[PDB]
Swiss-Prot record, chain A:
UniProt subcellular location: Plastid, Chloroplast
Subunit structure: Component of the chloroplast small ribosomal subunit (SSU). Mature 70S chloroplast ribosomes of higher plants consist of a small (30S) and a large (50S) subunit. The 30S small subunit contains 1 molecule of ribosomal RNA (16S rRNA) and 24 different proteins. The 50S large subunit contains 3 rRNA molecules (23S, 5S and 4.5S rRNA) and 33 different proteins.
Coiled-coil residue spans: none
Residues of the whole record sequence present: 121 to 235 of 236
Protein name, UniProt field: Small ribosomal subunit protein uS2c
Organism: Spinacia oleracea
Highest taxon of source: Eukaryota
Family as reported in the entry's similarity comment: Belongs to the universal ribosomal protein uS2 family.
Free-text function comment from the UniProt entry: Component of the chloroplast ribosome (chloro-ribosome), a dedicated translation machinery responsible for the synthesis of chloroplast genome-encoded proteins, including proteins of the transcription and translation machinery and components of the photosynthetic apparatus.
From Swiss-Prot, chain B:
GO biological process, one term: translation
Family: Belongs to the universal ribosomal protein uS3 family.
Record-linked SUPFAM superfamilies: Prokaryotic type KH domain (KH-domain type II), Ribosomal protein S3 C-terminal domain
Name by which UniProt lists this protein: Small ribosomal subunit protein uS3c
Keyword Lipid metabolism appears in the UniProt entry: no
One annotated Gene Ontology cellular component of this protein: chloroplast
Subunit organization: Component of the chloroplast small ribosomal subunit (SSU). Mature 70S chloroplast ribosomes of higher plants consist of a small (30S) and a large (50S) subunit. The 30S small subunit contains 1 molecule of ribosomal RNA (16S rRNA) and 24 different proteins. The 50S large subunit contains 3 rRNA molecules (23S, 5S and 4.5S rRNA) and 33 different proteins.
Residue ranges occupied by any KH type-2 domain in the UniProt entry: 47-118
Lineage, uppermost ranks: Eukaryota, Viridiplantae, Streptophyta, Embryophyta, Tracheophyta
Length: 115, 217
RNA sequence: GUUAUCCGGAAUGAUUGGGCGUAAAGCGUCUGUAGGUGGCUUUUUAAGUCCGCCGUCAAAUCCCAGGGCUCAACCCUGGACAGGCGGUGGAAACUACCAAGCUGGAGUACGGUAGGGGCAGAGGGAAUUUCCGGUGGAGCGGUGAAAUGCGUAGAGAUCGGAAAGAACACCAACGGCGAAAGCACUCUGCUGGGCCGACACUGACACUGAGAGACGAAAGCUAGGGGAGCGAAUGGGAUUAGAUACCCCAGUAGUCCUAGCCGUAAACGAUGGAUACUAGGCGCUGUGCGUAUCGACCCGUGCAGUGUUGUAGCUAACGCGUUAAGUAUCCCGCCUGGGGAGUACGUUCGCAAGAAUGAAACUCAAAGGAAUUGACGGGGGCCCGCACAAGCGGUGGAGCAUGUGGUUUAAUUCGAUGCAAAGCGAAGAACCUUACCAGGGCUUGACAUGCCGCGAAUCCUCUUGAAAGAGAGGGGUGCCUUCGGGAACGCGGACACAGGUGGUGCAUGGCUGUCGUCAGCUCGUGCCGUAAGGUGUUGGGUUAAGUCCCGCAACGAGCGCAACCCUCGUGUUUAGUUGCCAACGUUGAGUUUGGAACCCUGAACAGACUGCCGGUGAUAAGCCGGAGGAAGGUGAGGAUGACGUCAAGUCAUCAUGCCCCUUAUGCCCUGGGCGACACACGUGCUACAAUGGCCGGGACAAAGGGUCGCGAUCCCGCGAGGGUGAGCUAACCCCAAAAACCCGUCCUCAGUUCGGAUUGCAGGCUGCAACUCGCCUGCAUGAAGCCGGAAUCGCUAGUAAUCGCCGGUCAGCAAUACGGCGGUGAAUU
């Protein structure tokens, strides 16, 4: 829908299809603006509050994917393999644990720059 | 029973043309239908004796009759032209005189040409004589219906649907069987779906097959 | 092989092996004897128990190893086993006995707290009923409506006073107390249980518990009292098809008190009591503590008590969840299919009604529990169609047409009959059609193929007869062959068959109605639950619509919806006859030359897509208005109507299974029948007028038809129509001159210058032929009927209503059936 939006097919398509194709794009750029960049199936799944998104962790344990999470106080650590006991609401608590986890992935690759 | 509209009757105005396209004055119009139906009953069955021989084995696809004055086109579309034409030039010779003895009055010089189809699993008329031919030899029904679905999908089609009526495998109560794969838009006119209807013999009753083959959009 | 019989399968009596919240199952609740079980320490006994040994456990079976009949069965050696009992010599942890203790069990005392715990005796307030008196008026009481009843010898209502009985508002609370049942206005007297707290003391003195003893909601019973209200019974009124019910007016036992008796209840948390353990989040009562408690309060620590998206676990599921049906221990009660039964018999108890204990025969193969899908509901929440409502016209009344039952008849042929039967299949039945009846006839025979004979085949045939048919008459005999013979056709003969609108569409194909055009019906992947399944197709809004937006383990897709196709409404481009014709010459009639501009005509193209503006609305969808436009919010209206419901309709369309008939329910012909009737019902038409009728003049349509046809002009007849006959095979000819409407006149509401039914007499036309059975014309006659009960139908625009025309069917049954066209033109939401 991105390649036909900037082509010579815009003048040929009728007004009945031109109103539906831009409505389909409006729903596909708002929600699917995050999930795009990569394609493969992950081996490890990192998540913030897994009690709010229990639908995300319960679907990973049935396939055999190792679970890691940033568990708070309102959560249970039995279905999780390696847990990180810390706050999930305050913006400062979410920023430290997640950027230092990214620094661990960037250290086992190349270039150690700033935050 | 409570089925959808005939896709050969709904698509009569556009795309799919008539099996007979001609013109006549309302004085000799009634004799025009009688001469075109008598030969369509003699080419589809095509047997002088009381046997189950020719025409039904090769599979007839379409019979197009075009006439102006004293000459009919009668072009038959066959799957296998080995049975109708020759085994040594005698087969088409007895067919040339059979249509001549029935239609006379004026000098009716009838020319019959033959053309082939790309694949017999694309047209609805061979499927109505193939699957209904498996009911005559008493083979497993639901296995023959699922094989008629896949044999058309491998022949490059976008959708296919098959269904009969009652009296299956010798049962007292009448039931219905339905298997479908892909998409078959039954309502729209821009679908060019072709139809056919054939009857079975059977010593226990009588069956009736309906073919729905969806080509392009 | 069958039958009989025991065991197994039956962890369906389970000691190894089961259960009791709802499936069968805790006795209604306590106290408690026997019985079962019983904390901690040491010593001792050592009985149980355990070790070893000595007897006996007959032999033979069984089992292990090994032999003999040729194998085996069988026979046989030794061993094993005989799981037991007794005795002796030990071991001593546990259980038990004995002795001395300890303490967390349990109990008691001290000091406080809460409570409808119970019994007895008083006393308090409201109200109801009744008695008496005052005031005052004719109504009151009651119901979905009414009536019975109470009332002018005057109730009710109202005020004052009295008498009496019962229960006792509010506080009351998801509250509290009690073993259960059960118990609440206040007070006094006697009395029980529970809980907390510093402790002091005993010391396991414990737990459970068949029998047994005691307590028992209400109803009921005995004797003596009381009795306001309520109210079994009973008596009236009403409702209803009936109601010896519900409802209304009265009303006895009873309900209340004392004493005794009966002992039952979904006596239900339907989950017996006692003890120890096992994640958590909110609500009572005691007590300790919290800058001196500065405060409504804050932090603990116990008792009893709810709900919880309640977790683990348990459970068939629902659900329970430390007041669990969770994990365990102690003991008691109970079940082991449904009906019969919890009845019969017997015993016991009772004043009685009955209670308690508790069968069998026979009979079925099922009862039962939870949960799931769907449907249904005089269940609920929210939404859509003339569905109602708002409104117009109509039906049922009337005369006539037509269809169906019933009746009748020789037949009045068949099928369809709640809606999805009832001018319905037959869009056309005088013969035919027709299939039915009667009568006269033929049978491989009316129709198909094959064999044989005479033969071509035919035309005109004559006689008898209702005809079907039968007997004979001439006239006549083509085309090919080694003429032997054949095709086309005919009569006759033999045999397979031919033939069936005969039965069964609850044996079927094909096709249809119907809910429905309602809008839903499903799938892939992924999750949820043990699972059947569910989720997506739910929810919040929104549209004709799972249409769309948002929310949401749902994410996407398929059929359906929509759109694509056909006409209608605007314009534009192209092409102009049998079309049209502005400008220009006219026999005024486009009529002629001529012109293509316009109308029309026929193919294409453009255009509405809420798209744009604003408001509402959740800065969505969508809706409400507006702008621009011929046309907008699926433009109007068709076609198109899913998975499926009714084994709904059709084997009389056809086809087909089976069955049946086959000198026959097969076939031919003549006449009759289907349009017979005392009646009933449905669907229509014509009128009851004067917004109408009639006479005369007179303005505009669309859409279709037509060569065994449509048929003008002219002549003739009052007319239907007939004679002659042109043209059109057709936007060039004809079928029509369309009717309402409109101007003038007449009438002027009397069953009529409304209405035409019916009837007589005389004709026309189509066909052998029309009495039964026809259409139409002419003349005369001219009723019913004055808009019609209960009930009920369609339609929201160019629709209702109404006024004409055409077509299909067809020789003929032409505006009354069906289909199709246009004219005029609303009401209400």
């Amino acid at each position: 829908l991105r390649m036909e939006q900037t082509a010579g097919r815009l003048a040929r398509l009728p007004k009945r299809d031109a109103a539906v194709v831009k409505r389909q794009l409006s729903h596909l750029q708002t929600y699917l603006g995050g999930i795009k960049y990569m394609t493969g199936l992950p081996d490890i799944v990192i998540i913030v509050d897994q009690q709010e998104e229990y639908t995300a962790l319960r679907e990973c344990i049935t396939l055999g994917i190792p679970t890691i999470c940033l568990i708070d106080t309102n959560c249970n650590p039995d279905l999780a393999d390696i847990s990180i006991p810390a706050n999930d609401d305050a913006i400062a608590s979410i920023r430290l644990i997640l950027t230092k986890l990214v620094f661990a992935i960037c250290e086992g690759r190349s270039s150690y720059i700033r935050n | 029973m409570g089925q959808k509209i005939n896709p050969l009757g709904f698509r009569l105005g556009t795309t799919q043309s008539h099996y007979s396209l001609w013109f006549s004055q309302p004085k000799n119009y009634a004799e025009g239908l009688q001469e075109d139906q008598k030969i369509r009953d003699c080419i589809k069955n095509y047997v002088q004796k009381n046997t189950k021989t020719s025409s039904g084995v090769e599979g007839i696809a379409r019979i197009e009759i075009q006439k102006r004055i004293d000459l009919i086109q009668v072009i038959i579309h066959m799957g296998f032209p080995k049975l109708l034409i020759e085994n040594r030039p005698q087969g088409v010779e007895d067919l040339k005189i059979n249509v001549q003895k029935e239609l006379n009055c004026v000098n009716r010089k009838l020319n019959i040409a033959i053309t082939r189809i790309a694949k017999p699993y694309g047209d609805p008329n061979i499927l109505a004589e193939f699957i209904a031919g498996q009911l005559k030899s008493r083979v497993s029904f639901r296995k023959a219906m699922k094989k008629a679905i896949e044999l058309t999908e491998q022949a490059d089609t976008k959708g296919i649907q098959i269904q009969i009526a009652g009296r299956i495998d010798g049962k007292e109560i009448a039931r219905i069987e339905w298997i479908r794969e892909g998409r078959v838009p039954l309502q729209t006119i821009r679908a060019k779906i072709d139809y056919c209807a054939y009857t079975v013999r059977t010593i226990y009753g009588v069956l009736g097959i309906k073919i729905w083959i969806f080509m392009g959009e």
